[PDB]
Design a protein around this ligand. Structure first.
Ligand SMILES: Nc1nc2c(ncn2[C@@H]2O[C@H](COP(=O)(O)OP(=O)(O)OP(=O)(O)O)[C@@H](O)[C@H]2O)c(=O)[nH]1
Ligand SMILES: Nc1nc2c(ncn2[C@@H]2O[C@H](COP(=O)(O)OP(=O)(O)O)[C@@H](O)[C@H]2O)c(=O)[nH]1
Ligand SMILES: [Mg+2]
Lengths: 49, 126, 426, 277, 439
């Protein structure tokens, strides 16, 4: 019983960590996509000019 | 037997799907089942006797004189429709129980004679 | 002052009581440690009803925890409130009941009843003025229907002049999860009608219909059904522990619900239930609660109330509110639906008012209903019992352990006579 | 039928969208207010596992007021098949479940032995005199001294303590006398250092104790030696730890067993973060 | 705390016990050296292995099972294999000169010599059990040891231990393909004894698993290693409630209670679904309805009998993994309205449901795929009397000319029980008809 309660508490901590990672990854993806699009547009402008 | 039965020393067991199933069958809490209008729990603890007799019907928000509602019928400021959401009813019961329980009797070795017969004050002396 | 001793047995009864002690730990502001963390002083004015004081300001429940298998004792001690239960209250066996009533009532449930009877008699004389008893178990299992009906008979021999209340989990035809459940359900009902003052029948298919239709959930697991039941378990004694405008304890309910000694099978209901989309838009008013209590989609028992006549009806209200709208709405529903009530009892509605709503709600209302339509619940067990007993199927698990077949014979006779008493007043 | 999931607008999706938005809002409110379990555990671990600098001795004599580390040396014991290997360090251990539920440390706190070599905030002990006001003093054999641990906190001082056995007071797993930490000042915090060899013990009583040497630590009021149970395992928020008790162990020749041998470890002068080991 | 003692007798029991006991070591993460890996400092709270694995002061875990045979050809490969250090030196019992597919050698002459050595080892294994649920038996009908030595082992087990549960997993002869010539003689005699000395007899044959591995896993050329794993997957789903947690657990007495209506009928059928290759699971959606729809099809039966000819009596559904109790009720309710599935009149509620949270664990490099949910159905059907019909047709067609009888008379067995064992199941065939009569 004692170690089962310990496992339950550790699982709760793992749930919080999983939620934090799930909210960070979307921000990273949005930043990468925006940077790639802006760089592509600038390169097109320069070559055309 | 020797070809197929190999040690597999690759740390195979998985230990998280059981706990995910535990939480999935445990389900939603109070705040996501029954709690309404995102209300904090400190506000609605009140009683009719205290709100009507003890507090003398003190509601600063409501005007003293009722006015006609206009678009609807009837008189608008209703005391029974708008009760008081003040801090709740309190008196010395919590403090008395705290003093009776949380006191640890810091004098561990204390005879009945010494505890019952201290030096009396001169003010209470006659 | 007036103390309620809670009993729970089986796998189902252990998990309902686990969720039941969660809501009144919230309601009295009791932390999972065991201390008090609240604000109002009304919460400690009547706290000895459910919690016993210990040293250091620790409040522990007056509950008894019985099973023959340690499978669910490990879960209840590893829940959110696992530390709050006293370990001396846990009475566990060695081997499971195996979904057999003879195991739970004659052979394996016979040595374990002496250990429980020591525990309940130690807690009964701890109270100042014992109000009564409360029980929650399952008729479809081996431990709950086995020893739980054995314990019901034993306490009624010890303390006769009390009130005894149960919350039985009756079987269901569509959500039937055990082969041999007509045998264990029939034998418990024959023992229930003699030694019980109030019986609340709760059915699992009646609780799935609430979560699908009223609450709009996609995965309604047992943690929601055990918790909708737990709302009714606390709303029935809400005037015993809290002040109000019209108090009504457990005995005052049984006075106005039970006209004859065998008419004590109820249908419970809980009033304020709405989905998450419909939360912020629906206004909590007294007419909205009374519109929801009487609907057939809202009962916790799998019987349609429109196929019979409401013998007598109770309604326990909570929260700061008016009194004219309660008396008008309980009269308007009686005046319009005159064909749904008997004519030999006037004023079939009982009214009760508290002052503290359950936390997170503005007002609330619990429905306690004696009705003739609960005869339909016992017909679906009796038509399966005769269709099984005629071929003597699954019977050597019962006779071969010390049970004569005449315990099956009178289980037909009393159950069919009980439903025949319902036919006369319909 | 078939089910798709969160994003797809089919079936009963609106109530699921409401429920996930409510859950996300509640999670952000809780993590912004700071009631998050991982944040509390992070603060607790940051307080506990802080690096610390030890004292450095010149003449090899242990001084009062110096910061030392208690280390049980390793011996090839044949008592049990499984037991901790390598030198162990005496580290405090708070209660795990109460430590998760509440932020503040709960006195009394138990002790343990951990496979640790770098001095951290959990295993630095300061040798103190009960007479106090001791400057330029040498710790001597057979003399009373006390051990105080700050424990990664700059707030309070805690001392080792033990008492006579009682039917309500016992160790966690070995059922012997226990050793714990209290903030109270009494005579149950005093310990004595003695020579391991019983023949020369009284001859060496009253001599300045060497540093980084095997000595016996004996309590005064109960006269039990500090002992480390290697074969009994304690589960802890920081892994598996050996047990620690107060008991005197004797072989067939009445010589103290390697369980009772303890060594006080100072800091390396070349690198203060590392020890003499 | 609740512990099982498995018995493996014959060559079938050892070879099944090689693949069955590999899965328990690979489910709890117990290495072939006998010790759990040291990388478990964070992990804890695990004591579910005590049903089968006994601890030691050195941390070693040894199985609670006995391996019995009358030849050293099959056990010496275990003793010199990968798992030589794991099993006990004495829990692997060897005989001499086998039994040569003869029932009299297995029962009266050779199986009498070593029965006292095995009975000591069972008793030496039963005192450590602070709580023992019962016994599990793996053997074969068509063998000499698996049918001869088993027939008196169940007689000695019932005398020593009175009302303890006995559950069987037997290798029934397949209707078309088989190996031994005199298999009707051995199959008749051993099941005449064990009608009254057993409690539940799960059966599976060898042809119906050949059909499964062809049209599901796309294996054209399977061996017994491919077949033993699928039998080894059924045993885990049966026993998973005693090991791991769940919303509804079943003990070894609970699903014995809900599958035998009368004492003479204790013959279920074993089925398993979903079974699929590694590639095809990557695309097909596995709903709770689709894994219970596969169990009811006659093509997925693991015994070569069509259930459409007969009527079901009782059923047991045993779920694993991410199973919600909502979808169990809706999938069962669809089956209740099916006309193709027929039920007897006296069992209105035939379903017993158990759920465990552990998803099914699959051996690395195996033919079957890693899935999150699976169901094993132990269904009782009247259509197993078809299986007895084709074998008793085979028996009297060979007994008429007194073929092979002198192998049985000249060993120590009287010819008088050749007729009685045929007359025993003549009345048993009358019993399956009377049960299926609608009232
Ligand atoms: N499916 C399957 N069947 C097996 C396996 N091992 C043995 N059998 C069956 O066993 C039958 C032959 O009898 P055996 O088990 O080899 O030998 P026995 O039962 O010990 O009898 P004796 O050799 O006389 O001692 C074959 O018809 C197979 O069907 C196996 O690993 N998988
Ligand atoms: N509502 C609800 N029903 C439950 C719960 N646990 C079990 N049941 C029901 O109870 C029946 C089985 O009861 P059982 O465990 O055999 O009772 P026991 O033998 O006394 O422990 C199943 O059909 C379930 O539907 C629960 O936590 N909540
Ligand atoms: Mg053989």
């Amino acid at each position: 019983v004692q170690r089962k309660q310990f496992l339950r508490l550790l699982q709760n901590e793992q749930f919080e960590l999983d939620m934090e990672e799930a909210i960070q990854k979307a921000e990273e993806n949005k930043r990468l996509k925006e940077l790639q699009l802006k760089q592509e547009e600038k390169l097109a402008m320069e070559l055309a000019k | 037997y020797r070809k197929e039965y190999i040690p597999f020393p690759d740390h195979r067991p998985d230990q998280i799907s059981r706990w995910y199933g535990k939480r999935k069958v445990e389900g939603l809490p109070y705040k996501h089942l029954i709690t309404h209008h995102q209300e904090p729990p400190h506000r609605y603890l009140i009683s009719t006797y205290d709100d009507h007799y003890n507090r003398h019907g003190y509601n600063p928000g409501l005007p003293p004189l009722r006015t006609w509602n206009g678009q609807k019928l009837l008189w608008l400021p209703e005391k029974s429709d708008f009760p008081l959401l003040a801090p709740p009813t309190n008196y010395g019961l919590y403090e008395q129980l705290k003093q009776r329980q949380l006191t640890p009797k810091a004098g561990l070795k204390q005879s009945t004679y010494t505890s019952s017969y201290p030096r009396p004050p001169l003010c209470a002396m006659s | 002052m007036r103390e309620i001793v809670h009993l729970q047995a089986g796998q189902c009864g252990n998990q309902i009581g686990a969720k039941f002690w969660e809501v009144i730990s919230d309601e009295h502001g009791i932390d999972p440690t065991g201390t008090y963390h609240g604000d109002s002083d009304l919460q400690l004015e009547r706290i000895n009803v459910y919690y016993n004081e210990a040293t250091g300001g620790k409040y522990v429940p007056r509950a008894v925890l019985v099973d023959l298998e340690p499978g669910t004792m490990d879960s209840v001690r590893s829940g959110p409130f696992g530390q709050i239960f006293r370990p001396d209250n846990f009475v566990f066996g060695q081997s499971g009941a195996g979904n057999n009533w003879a195991k739970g009532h004659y052979t394996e449930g016979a040595e374990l009843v002496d250990s429980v009877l020591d525990v309940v008699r130690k807690e009964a004389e701890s109270c100042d003025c014992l109000q009564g008893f409360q029980l929650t178990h399952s008729l479809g299992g081996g431990t709950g229907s086995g020893m739980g009906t054995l314990l019901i008979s034993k306490i009624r021999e010890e303390y006769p002049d009390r009130i005894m209340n149960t919350f039985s989990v009756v079987p269901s035809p569509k959500v039937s999860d055990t082969v041999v459940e007509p045998y264990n359900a029939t034998l418990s009902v024959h023992q229930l009608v003699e030694n019980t003052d109030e019986t609340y029948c709760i059915d699992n298919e009646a609780l799935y219909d609430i979560c699908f239709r009223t609450l709009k959930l996609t995965t309604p697991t047992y943690g929601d059904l055990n918790h909708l039941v737990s709302a009714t378990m606390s709303g029935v004694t809400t005037c015993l522990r809290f002040p109000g405008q019209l108090n009504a304890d457990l005995r005052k309910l049984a006075v106005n619900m039970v006209p004859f000694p065998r008419l004590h099978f109820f249908m419970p209901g809980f009033a304020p239930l709405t989905s998450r989309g419909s939360q912020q838009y629906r206004a909590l008013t007294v007419p909205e609660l009374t519109q929801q209590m009487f609907d057939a989609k809202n009962m916790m028992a799998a019987c349609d109330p429109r196929h019979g006549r409401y013998l007598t009806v109770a309604a326990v209200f909570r929260g700061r509110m008016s009194m004219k709208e309660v008396d008008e709405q309980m009269l308007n529903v009686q005046n319009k639906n005159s064909s749904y009530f008997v004519e030999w009892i006037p004023n079939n509605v009982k009214t009760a008012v508290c002052d503290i709503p359950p936390r997170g709600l503005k007002m609330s209302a619990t429905f306690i209903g004696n009705s003739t339509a609960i005869q339909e619940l016992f017909k679906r067990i009796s038509e399966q019992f005769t269709a099984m007993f005629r071929r003597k199927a699954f019977l050597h698990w019962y006779t071969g352990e010390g049970m004569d077949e005449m315990e099956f014979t009178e289980a037909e006779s009393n159950m069919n006579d009980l439903v025949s008493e319902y036919q006369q007043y319909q | 039928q078939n089910v798709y999931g969160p994003g797809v607008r089919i079936g009963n999706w609106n109530e699921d969208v409401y429920l996930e938005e409510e859950l996300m809002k509640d999670f952000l409110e809780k993590r912004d207010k700071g009631k998050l379990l991982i944040q509390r555990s992070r603060r607790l671990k940051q307080n506990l596992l802080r690096p610390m600098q030890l004292s450095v001795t010149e003449d090899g004599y242990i001084h009062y007021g110096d910061k030392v580390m208690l280390v049980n040396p390793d011996d090839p014991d044949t008592e049990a098949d499984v037991f901790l290997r390598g030198d162990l360090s005496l580290c405090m251990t708070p209660d795990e479940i109460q430590s998760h539920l509440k932020d503040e440390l709960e006195v009394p706190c138990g002790l343990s032995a951990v496979q640790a070599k770098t001095p951290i905030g959990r295993n630095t002990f300061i040798i103190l005199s009960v007479h106090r006001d001791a400057t330029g003093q040498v710790l001597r054999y057979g003399q009373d001294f006390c051990l105080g641990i700050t424990g990664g906190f700059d707030n309070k001082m805690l001392y080792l303590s033990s008492d006579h056995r009682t039917l309500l007071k016992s160790s966690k797993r070995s059922w012997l006398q226990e050793v714990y930490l209290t903030d109270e000042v009494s005579h149950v915090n005093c310990w004595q250092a003695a020579f391991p060899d019983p023949q020369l013990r009284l001859e060496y009583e009253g001599f300045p104790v060497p540093a980084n040497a095997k000595i016996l630590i004996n309590h005064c009021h109960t006269n039990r030696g500090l002992a480390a149970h290697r074969h009994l395992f304690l589960s802890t928020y920081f892994g598996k730890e050996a047990e620690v008790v107060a008991h005197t162990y004797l072989d067939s020749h009445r010589v103290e067993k390697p369980r009772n041998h303890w060594m006080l470890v100072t800091g390396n002068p070349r690198d203060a973060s590392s020890s003499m080991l | 705390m609740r512990e099982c003692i498995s018995i493996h007798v014959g060559q079938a029991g050892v070879q099944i016990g090689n693949a069955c006991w590999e899965l328990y070591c690979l489910e709890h993460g117990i290495q072939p050296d006998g010790q759990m890996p040291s990388d478990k400092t964070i992990g804890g709270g695990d004591d579910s292995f005590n049903t089968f694995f006994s601890e030691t002061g050195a941390g070693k875990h040894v199985p609670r099972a006995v391996f019995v045979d009358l030849e050293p050809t099959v056990i010496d490969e275990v003793r010199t294999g990968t798992y030589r250090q794991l099993f006990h030196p004495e829990q692997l019992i060897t005989g001499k000169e086998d039994a040569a597919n003869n029932y009299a050698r297995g029962h009266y002459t050779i199986g009498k010599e070593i029965i006292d050595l095995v009975l000591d080892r069972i008793r030496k294994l039963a005192d450590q059990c602070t709580g023992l649920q019962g016994f599990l038996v793996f053997h074969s009908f068509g063998g000499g040891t698996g049918s001869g030595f088993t027939s008196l082992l169940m007689e000695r087990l019932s005398v020593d231990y009175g009302k303890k549960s006995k559950l069987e997993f037997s290798i029934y002869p397949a209707p078309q393909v088989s190996t031994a010539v005199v298999e009707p003689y051995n199959s008749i005699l051993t099941t005449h004894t064990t009608l009254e000395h057993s409690d539940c007899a799960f059966m599976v044959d060898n042809e119906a698993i050949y059909d499964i591995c062809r049209r599901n896993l796309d294996i054209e050329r399977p061996t017994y290693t491919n077949l033993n794993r699928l039998i080894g997957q059924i045993v885990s789903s049966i026993t998973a409630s005693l090991r791991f947690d769940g919303a509804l657990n079943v003990d070894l007495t609970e699903f014995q209670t809900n599958l035998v209506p009368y004492p003479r009928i204790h013959f279920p059928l074993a089925t398993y679904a979903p079974v699929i290759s590694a590639e095809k699971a990557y695309h097909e959606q596995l709903s709770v309805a689709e894994i219970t729809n596969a169990c009811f099809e006659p093509a997925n039966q693991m015994v070569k009998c069509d259930p459409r000819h007969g009527k079901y009596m009782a059923c047991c559904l045993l779920y694993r993994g991410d199973v919600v109790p909502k979808d169990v009720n809706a999938a069962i309710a669809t089956i209740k309205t099916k006309r193709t599935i027929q039920f007897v009149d006296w069992c209105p509620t035939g379903f017993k449901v158990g759920i465990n949270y552990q998803p099914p664990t699959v051996v690395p490099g195996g033919d079957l795929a890693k899935v999150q949910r699976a169901v094993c159905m132990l269904s009782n059907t009247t259509a197993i009397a078809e299986a007895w019909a084709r074998l008793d047709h085979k028996f009297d067609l060979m007994y008429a000319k007194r073929a092979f009888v002198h192998w049985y008379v000249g060993e120590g067995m009287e010819e008088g029980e050749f007729s009685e064992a045929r007359e025993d199941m003549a009345a048993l065939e009358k019993d399956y008809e009377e049960v299926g009569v609608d009232s």
